Symmetry: D2
Subunit: 383 residues, 4 copies
Amino acid sequence: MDFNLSNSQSDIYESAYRFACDVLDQDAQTRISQKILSTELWKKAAAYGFAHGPVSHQFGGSELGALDTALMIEALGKGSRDIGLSFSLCAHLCACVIPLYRFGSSELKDKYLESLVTGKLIAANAATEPDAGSDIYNMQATAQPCEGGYILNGKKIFITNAPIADVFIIYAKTNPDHGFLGVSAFLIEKGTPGLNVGEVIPKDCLSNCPWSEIVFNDIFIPQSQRIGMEGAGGAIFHDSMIWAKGCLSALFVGGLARLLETTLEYAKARQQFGKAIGQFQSVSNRIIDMKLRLEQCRLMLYRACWKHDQGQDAEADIAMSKLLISEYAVQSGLDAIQTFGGAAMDQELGLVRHLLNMIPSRIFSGTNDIQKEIIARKLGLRG
Amino acid sequence: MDFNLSNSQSDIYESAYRFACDVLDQDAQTRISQKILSTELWKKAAAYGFAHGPVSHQFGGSELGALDTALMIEALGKGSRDIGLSFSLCAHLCACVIPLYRFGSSELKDKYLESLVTGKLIAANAATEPDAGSDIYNMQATAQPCEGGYILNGKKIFITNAPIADVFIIYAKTNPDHGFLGVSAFLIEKGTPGLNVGEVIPKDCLSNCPWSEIVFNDIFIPQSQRIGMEGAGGAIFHDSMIWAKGCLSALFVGGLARLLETTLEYAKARQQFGKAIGQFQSVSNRIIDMKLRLEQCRLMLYRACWKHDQGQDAEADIAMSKLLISEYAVQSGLDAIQTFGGAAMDQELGLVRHLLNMIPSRIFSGTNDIQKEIIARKLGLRG
Amino acid sequence: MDFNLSNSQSDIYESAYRFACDVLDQDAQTRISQKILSTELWKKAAAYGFAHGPVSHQFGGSELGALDTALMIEALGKGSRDIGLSFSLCAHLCACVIPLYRFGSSELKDKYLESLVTGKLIAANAATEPDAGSDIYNMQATAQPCEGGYILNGKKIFITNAPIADVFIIYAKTNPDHGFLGVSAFLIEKGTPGLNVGEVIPKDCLSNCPWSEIVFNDIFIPQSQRIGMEGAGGAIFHDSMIWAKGCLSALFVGGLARLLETTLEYAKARQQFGKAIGQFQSVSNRIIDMKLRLEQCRLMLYRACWKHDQGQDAEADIAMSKLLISEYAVQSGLDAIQTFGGAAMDQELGLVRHLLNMIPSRIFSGTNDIQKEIIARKLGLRG
Amino acid sequence: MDFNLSNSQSDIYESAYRFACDVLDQDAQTRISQKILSTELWKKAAAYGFAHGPVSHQFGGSELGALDTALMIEALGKGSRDIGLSFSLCAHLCACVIPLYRFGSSELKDKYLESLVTGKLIAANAATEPDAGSDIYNMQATAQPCEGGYILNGKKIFITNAPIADVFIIYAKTNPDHGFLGVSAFLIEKGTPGLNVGEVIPKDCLSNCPWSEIVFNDIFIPQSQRIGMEGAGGAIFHDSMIWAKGCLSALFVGGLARLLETTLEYAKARQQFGKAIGQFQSVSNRIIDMKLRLEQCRLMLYRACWKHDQGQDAEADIAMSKLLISEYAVQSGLDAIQTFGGAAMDQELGLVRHLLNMIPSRIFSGTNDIQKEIIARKLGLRG
Ligand SMILES: Cc1cc2nc3c(=O)[nH]c(=O)nc-3n(C[C@H](O)[C@H](O)[C@H](O)COP(=O)(O)OP(=O)(O)OC[C@H]3O[C@@H](n4cnc5c(N)ncnc54)[C@H](O)[C@@H]3O)c2cc1C
Ligand SMILES: Cc1cc2nc3c(=O)[nH]c(=O)nc-3n(C[C@H](O)[C@H](O)[C@H](O)COP(=O)(O)OP(=O)(O)OC[C@H]3O[C@@H](n4cnc5c(N)ncnc54)[C@H](O)[C@@H]3O)c2cc1C
Ligand SMILES: Cc1cc2nc3c(=O)[nH]c(=O)nc-3n(C[C@H](O)[C@H](O)[C@H](O)COP(=O)(O)OP(=O)(O)OC[C@H]3O[C@@H](n4cnc5c(N)ncnc54)[C@H](O)[C@@H]3O)c2cc1C
Ligand SMILES: Cc1cc2nc3c(=O)[nH]c(=O)nc-3n(C[C@H](O)[C@H](O)[C@H](O)COP(=O)(O)OP(=O)(O)OC[C@H]3O[C@@H](n4cnc5c(N)ncnc54)[C@H](O)[C@@H]3O)c2cc1C
Ligand code: PRO
Ligand code: PRO
Ligand code: PRO
Ligand code: PRO
Ligand SMILES: [Cl-]
Ligand SMILES: [Cl-]
């Protein structure tokens, strides 16, 4: 039992924080105002190491474990206000780079993986459908086996990075009779006949992180573009959501650390009634709640990632971390706004935008109600 | 003890709801998208009766009590998505029309009040300053008595409607030695030498309701433009915040009623796992929380307004209502978003914008921490 | 819309409060210390009017509506610390007197009802079983029709007043094929062959209110002792739980009013750091939460009872009231204890005993999770 | 960063758990029913190692760090239902053994410390007074320096173990002009002229852990019985409350672990509506809250104790741990009761008694409002 970072871990965090502050955060307000996702900046960040994660040196990575990857992303969330860009990068890493690395064939990794790792190609993961969100293994898209490969049809929605992606990791039923065990995963390229990527659909939360729908009309998928084995798509999707929960969520821990620093500074500076507003217990009690949340959920995340790195069963720990971080990020966003009063309603300060950016953390990679179903199953309450 | 509306009260509600639905709500999405506050629509709403409140027939009003006024505004909040416009109207009514009616001289009412009541003139109330928000009686603006009137200097911030107002109800120290008892209230016109109204300052919450700062540089205020007696400004401001709490807050009750109807409809329609998502207790428990909040806070508001109409001391009841409504409006906005999942991130649906619009309800007319100070004082805990 | 009591309602409340203070509360600490339920005091309270409720003058009652009955019981809960005795009386009234009055035949009312109304006979209601608590219509006790009546077998548990009751209102399956529609209700007397009433089972909550199990071994029930029609037991039980929710819960509103008065007094009297502890916002914020809870849930209860008296559908309103009152009573018990600090751990003060007494309010007459199921059904979420 | 116990730490935990289960828990229900604190059992536990903590081998201890001590006490709280006895032992260890070891002279340790470490002598710590609870450095007891020592007068209240103690560690003003810097600490023996120990004062929480008041009437304290330097009593008391927070609180973590195991077992076993009650999300969501609380607060405690062992500043971490553990212990006690329904009201099961035993965790060693003041000071909000 130990709560210090190794020198190696500290260096990873500090180097990422410096990049996030000095490269990504510079000029972020202009990009955020204009709803710009800078693909040139995105590619620099990817190549710096944010698209690497556990990927081996053979494909351009540094073979980080889950805790190291989480530290890097925590630093990114603390260091850069441009959380839409950070979310876009972490989605590419966790839902696309990592499943290709972990399950792709030698031939598929050789063709595509280093390009994803260095950010030469942007990827999007397409699983959700209009009738399959929480009930994801009810997806209706079909990849019907044929000579040479598969015929793919269906519609995917809410796809992060679809308007900017070069390749798509897509999940579809190769055996529509089944649920989880009837799903396969495939890699398809932008431009393939029958792939119709929709125009970006605007949103107020994560507003510069583009998403859209994609429609498959009789796409031919060559056999070699299946990722992993036939019918293993459910297991692949599952494994990628573990990395998305476990490591992508670190982004919101680092955002909460930055939020707490800003809020503490204001509560010491702002005077009313002849003293700093932090001297009133109504004010200081809320800030203490923010601090208690940050310390608790960061330890939960660190232990979940550490257990993964030890080869222990970390599924319940990662669901617990994702649930706590996202709830705490939203509640603390509200508490920061309440500390600032009327001065919160100020687009240069970013507190309201911060709350908007935290709202979807309770939804993606599985809603918090679904995390509770996962935890309930691990506790033996779904027997 | 009775919980039915009179036929008169029912008619007031239904007529206001019809206007809000058929006149203000029509085309609201376009105006909201473009951040437009339609002054022509605003003036129609004012003249319909939303700028009238308790004002007598002599000045164009219908002599509504507080409960009737609250019913009208509840209907407005349920019937129109354009809550920025509604907030702008209710600010003009509660913080400007009502103090002029209740404290203005015959000569000042004769000159200005009917024009405010019919919406021919838009008004803004200017009390808050950079160093006087919660500690409002620390305001530093000064109205130095001189022959003929006063010389006014100072700066006001966060002023709803300032960029569109024709007249300003302003609070300033006529005796800078004192706090509450050193404040007077004045009416000044747009265009007066020395009045510098700032350009609209954008915000994401209530985004089409314009506000800005105003600066006074050696403005001469003629004696006849003082509202009420010298040194009575604190009492006037206080009384106007009672109407702003007590009746303007009704807007958010009606918004919560509309939100609950939308959320219940979705939870019955949306299927996952072979059933309506409202069949899962995680989902239905949150919707029940929304329903419990709405029923409780609407009764608190109705009783506070009814006690006012009976001539009872309603100050603590109005502070309790404002506190509960605003907290419940924010929490229920979050609960609706969580019910919809990814479909909440949809600008046409308006759920995220609804939450943005509710966030400032915990701040204006006194933050919720200040409401608790008021309640604590009434309970004898500030002795 | 009106929030004043009629003179008649005020008199009912004040007379009950005086009785509770001057008759039941006198000497209560000694009885509570010794875990005594004074049947002589119980009978005086019953005859004063607490066992009357809606019962007509023909049987000794005053034909109170639900709101009047709730006012009487609110006064009882504020006026007497002996909540175990009050709970025992209200259980007899709501679960036994009222179903006999509302559904019993002329012959059964003539024989028993006035004796229950004046407290000459104590009654207990026996529905719950080891395998039928929330799922009450899964009860397995059977009343097999035969010549002359029924043969009753089974076991009931958690029966308030069973060790002191003279008669028992019991629910059993006359058609074991069905659930709700297979239940009938019966009145049986202490002493009947085959009735085995268990010895009192001690508890720390409501510790002087006796309960035990009862076992039926081939009891013969004469036909004339069935209450209402065959198979109508589910509807009778349902209707009695409405009165138990709706009116018995008033007891905990009056207890919260007494608790708040005690807590406010202490927070003004107790000094630390040179001032009253109520001057610290951590302390006053919790007391304000107690006050907000009491005002909200009392209005919900009053409206639920008023709607019942108007002949409106009040089922959802009564479930909402029972849910809020019991949750708020428990949370406010904890908040009072926290206000007192170490002085809460004092058996003469009664704050810890008060919390114990509130804990079962979330369980009896249907748990709060079951109230949410009822509300969810009324909202259309169980379709 | 590591979350495994060393083999040494695991052995400490398992050995303590075995003792708590096989020695202290055996027959605990009878002792709890009779409100017995078994001094023979207490002394066996003390000598086994629960009265040792950081004390060196020279005085009979094993020189445990804070994390090891916390592990031992966590095991005690999980293994034995007799939390009153455990609390009594940990109070003796943290508030009496440890300050004597850390600040006592060679002569005072030589005379008394090994006897306290082996439990031959029971000790009580007496700081709180009628007018000095949270404001502890306002204590009014006086130890007036004289030739040879001090004349002690005053009254202490809420003193754990006073009715059974052989020695008393007492705090009094040697310079009544000052607060914190005017306090000294002394060791006095039962039986000294002028010491009047009150009879046990009963309580429902921790009901077999005896406490009473003590009154000093012109006690002569010999110079050699002062603990540490003159005027250092505030620092000594402060340091002992760190151990009381940081390590004694571990008791309630182990109690929550035992509670969660019992609650999970019941939610899988108890059927209603044809399934285990844990299958309903209302039930499983509450149990998940218990699990999330236990994992978070146990990590906070482990890190606080680990930081102490590393020589880092752990004051804020220990205040955060004490605050979270005690709040979570109370809330989870309520959640367990709600899981069991009517079966919670069963003295053999102990769930209601468990909640009673957790209620004082939010009060002793400084209330949770005072922990928030400590955290606020460490955050720079009390500047
Ligand atoms: C910012 C963002 C980025 C996204 N990126 C991607 C992406 O790149 N690729 C991709 O494939 N998807 C993506 N998603 C989609 C996301 O995975 C889904 O939104 C999510 O799984 C929830 O599905 P849904 O929106 O259909 O909600 P629904 O499943 O309809 O849920 C609606 C409500 O019902 C509740 N509910 C549903 N089932 C249960 C149950 N069994 N028990 C209790 N409550 C239940 C939910 O918790 C929620 O409260 C993204 C979403 C967001 C917000
Ligand atoms: C939408 C909107 C419209 C507005 N319209 C107008 C308008 O038309 N005219 C006008 O004059 N003003 C207007 N206001 C300003 C509003 O009145 C102030 O924002 C408000 O009074 C709070 O002041 P502040 O923003 O300076 O916050 P501060 O006073 O700085 O408060 C900051 C934080 O400190 C807390 N705090 C302060 N003092 C205490 C205390 N004693 N105890 C406990 N906590 C304390 C507050 O609760 C808050 O959490 C508007 C504000 C909003 C949001
Ligand atoms: C003080 C007291 C007095 C009583 N007096 C009487 C009396 O006089 N006569 C009488 O007949 N009974 C009496 N009862 C019994 C009472 O009616 C039952 O305790 C109650 O209905 C709950 O049943 P149970 O205890 O079997 O809990 P269970 O039904 O076992 O409930 C256990 C847990 O499961 C939850 N749960 C169960 N089903 C669902 C579901 N569908 N959805 C979600 N959660 C669910 C419950 O909410 C609870 O959290 C009394 C109880 C109390 C506490
Ligand atoms: C089980 C138990 C065992 C104990 N054992 C011992 C023992 O062995 N020796 C010993 O000396 N003492 C002992 N104590 C006493 C304990 O230290 C005091 O009870 C505690 O410090 C609180 O003091 P008080 O009871 O006077 O509460 P008060 O100080 O009166 O507090 C009352 C309320 O006011 C609040 N409050 C007070 N000041 C502030 C502030 N500045 N800001 C915000 N809120 C404030 C408190 O948080 C609380 O809500 C024990 C207490 C308990 C419950
Ligand atoms: O399926 C999802 O929801 C995840 C979210 C991050 C990228 N894709
Ligand atoms: O002073 C304020 O805060 C109020 C809010 C509505 C208009 N002016
Ligand atoms: O069935 C029950 O739970 C109710 C509680 C009051 C009397 N009987
Ligand atoms: O002073 C107190 O409150 C601590 C509690 C444990 C023993 N003494
Ligand atoms: Cl469910
Ligand atoms: Cl304060």
